[PDB]
C-alpha cells in the first residue's frame, strides 16, 4: 500500500536575502519536488497550512558545476515555487522567519 | 523467386568454371514458378511461389 501526502511535494523552504524580502509582501518561496506542477502545489499548500493561495510561480535551477581535484562535480538541480498567499494572509509561523 | 513456400528449397551456391579454369562464384536457383493455390475445392485461389518439383509431385492444387 502507498499513502500519498502533500508534504511529499514540498521539500524545504529557501532562506536568502531575496526570499525574506518577499515574505514582507506575504509571498513565500519553497523548494519542491522537481516533477510537480503549479496546480499540484497550490492544492498541496492549501491543504498543509490551511490558507488561501492566490497564484504560484515556479522556476528551474541548474546545479552549479564545482571543480574538484578528483574531477568536475556537479550539484543537484532543483525547482523553486514562489507561492503568493491571498488577502486572508495568515502568516506561516512554522517558516521560522 | 528462389525460395519455395512449401518445401523451402534454396539456391545452391557454386563456382562457374571457365576454359582457363578461372573459378567465379555463382548460384543455382530453383525453378520456382508462380502458382494459384486452391487450398479448398470451394475455389478461392491464393497466389504463392512453388518449385517445379512440388508442382510435379502434386503438392499444390490448381482448381
Amino acid at each position: 500500500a502507498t499513502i500519498t501526502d502533500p508534504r511529499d511535494i514540498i521539500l524545504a523552504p529557501v532562506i536568502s536575502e531575496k526570499s525574506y524580502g518577499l515574505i514582507e509582501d506575504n509571498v513565500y518561496t519553497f523548494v519542491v519536488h522537481p516533477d510537480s506542477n503549479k496546480t499540484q502545489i497550490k492544492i498541496a499548500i492549501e491543504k498543509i497550512f490551511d490558507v488561501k493561495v492566490d497564484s504560484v510561480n515556479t522556476a528551474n535551477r541548474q546545479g552549479k558545476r564545482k571543480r574538484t581535484r578528483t574531477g568536475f562535480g556537479k550539484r543537484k538541480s532543483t525547482k523553486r515555487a514562489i507561492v503568493k498567499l491571498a488577502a486572508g494572509s495568515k502568516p506561516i509561523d512554522l517558516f521560522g522567519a | 523467386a528462389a525460395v519455395c513456400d512449401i518445401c523451402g528449397k534454396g539456391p545452391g551456391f557454386g563456382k562457374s568454371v571457365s576454359h582457363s579454369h578461372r573459378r567465379t562464384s555463382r548460384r543455382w536457383n530453383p525453378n520456382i514458378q508462380p502458382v494459384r493455390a486452391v487450398t479448398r475445392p470451394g475455389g478461392n485461389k491464393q497466389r504463392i511461389n512453388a518449385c517445379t518439383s512440388c508442382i510435379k509431385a502434386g503438392k499444390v492444387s490448381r482448381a
Binding site: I3, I10, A12, V14, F95, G96 | -
Partner: protein, 64 residues
C-alpha cells in the same frame, strides 16, 4: 523509535494513521534544518526509518 514487534499488532487504520503522523514530524524536521534551529541531526534518520518500518508491516499483511 518503535520496535517492529509492537508495530505488528496495530490494526490497518492505526498504522496508516501512524504513517501520516510521522510524515508530519518529518516535514517539520526538514523545515527546522533549513531554518537552522534544529540541533539533533539523527532525529531525521530515526523518522525516515520509522516510515519504512510501517510500510514494510503494511506490505507484509497484503500478501503474507
Amino acid at each position: 523509535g518503535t520496535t517492529p514487534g509492537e508495530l505488528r499488532e496495530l490494526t490497518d487504520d492505526e498504522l496508516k494513521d501512524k504513517l501520516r503522523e510521522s510524515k508530519e514530524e518529518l516535514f517539520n524536521l526538514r523545515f527546522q534544518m533549513a531554518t537552522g534551529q534544529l540541533s539533533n541531526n539523527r532525529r531525521l534518520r530515526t523518522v525516515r526509518q520509522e516510515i519504512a518500518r510501517v510500510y514494510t508491516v503494511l506490505r507484509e499483511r497484503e500478501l503474507g
